[PDB]
Amino acid sequence: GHMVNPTVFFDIAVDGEPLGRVSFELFADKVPKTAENFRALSTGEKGFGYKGSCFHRIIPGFMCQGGDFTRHNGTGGKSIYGEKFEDENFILKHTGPGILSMANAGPNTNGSQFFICTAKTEWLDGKHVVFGKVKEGMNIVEAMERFGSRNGKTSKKITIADCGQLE
Numbered sequence: 001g002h003m004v005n006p007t008v009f010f011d012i013a014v015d016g017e018p019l020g021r022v023s024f025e026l027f028a029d030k031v032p033k034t035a036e037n038f039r040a041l042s043t044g045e046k047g048f049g050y051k052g053s054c055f056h057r058i059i060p061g062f063m064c065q066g067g068d069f070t071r072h073n074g075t076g077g078k079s080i081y082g083e084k085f086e087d088e089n090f091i092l093k094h095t096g097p098g099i100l101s102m103a104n105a106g107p108n109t110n111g112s113q114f115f116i117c118t119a120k121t122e123w124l125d126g127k128h129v130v131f132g133k134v135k136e137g138m139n140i141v142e143a144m145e146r147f148g149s150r151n152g153k154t155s156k157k158i159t160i161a162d163c164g165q166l167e
């Protein structure tokens, strides 16, 4: 039947203590290649992905950034496509808190790093591929956000203790 946009979850921990679950709708109907990358990295089904990785940069009033599961500091990560991959489209815009979007290092350099907006970030439109949104647990993102700082360093260790697909 109809392709249903996937739902994936992160179970977040703070210095190893459970915080809560954030779930995301992935817009596979608009950005299928970008949605599939994040989906597969969330289930771990290729043998690598987000489980155990950290949020390395959190700026209150802006965004939480994660997905560097290879170097844990924003210099690493990889997609499921054996190389960085193209900006699929910029159809979806950075409209407010909860938007899930790809981090990158230039045109057509998407890997595994992503960010969750905690504010409207419209100046990123046409530069970062929006591919999902928080579905449930925006309150957990708001709780994470409090452990960031102006320069992005986190004051507690924010990890994805578990992750996977709900639907």
Ligand SMILES: CC(C)[C@H](NC(=O)OC(C)(C)C)C(=O)N[C@H]1Cc2cccc(c2)OCCCCOC(=O)[C@@H]2CCCN(N2)C1=O
Pocket (backbone or CB within 6 Å): 057, 059, 063, 065, 074, 075, 076, 102, 103, 104, 105, 106, 113, 114, 115, 152
């Ligand atoms: C994904 C890694 C590989 C990549 N590395 C990188 O490009 O490395 C160099 C510079 C080539 C060596 C990176 O992290 N890309 C950054 C670029 C950026 C964009 C917009 C503003 C930026 C930086 O900085 C200003 C504000 C700092 C806080 O906002 C942030 O950190 C942003 C928040 C959105 C996601 N976001 N990070 C990125 O897509």
